[PDB]
Design a protein around this nucleic acid. Structure first.
Length: 49
DNA sequence: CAGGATGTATATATGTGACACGTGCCTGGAGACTAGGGAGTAATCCCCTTGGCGGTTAAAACGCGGGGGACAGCGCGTACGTGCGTTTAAGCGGTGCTAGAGCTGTCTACGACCAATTGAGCGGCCTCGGCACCGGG
């Protein structure tokens, strides 16, 4: 959990073309983020703890 | 703010229903006295199912606002109560009759009971698939 932001920033820095999805927050926020996440090309790289 | 006009008590009385009280019967009970059985109390002790630690989010809670529901006032209508008269079958108790609940006597098939044998059921274990969970329409 301490390096999720670090990984996200490194991805945004080096490879700007990846759709990054940081899976964090309360349950309700996690459900909101999961809503429609099964669709194709919704995100390219997911970062979780 | 009275008073006929009812209705509801209150008190007394008596004699016929019913508690109340002998008189003896006895047969079903109630207890005493030996002998035999037996299941649960008591002490350990192995083993699960409680009661006790720290987090996570989900539900309880607090507030707000207005909206629809409770409760009170009021009035219209009709039906439900009360009284009077007519009607009916309900209460009484008197007689007649027999049907079967009950007591009784005899004979008997069914079940408790006891011993040996057998497999139906149940704890246990594992593999698996019906539905819990979930995110898009």
């Amino acid at each position: 959990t301490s390096v999720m932001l670090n990984w996200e920033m490194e991805l945004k820095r080096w490879c700007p073309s990846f759709k990054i999805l940081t899976y964090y927050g309360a349950q309700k926020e996690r459900k909101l983020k999961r809503q429609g996440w099964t669709k194709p090309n919704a995100f390219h790289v997911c970062i979780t703890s």
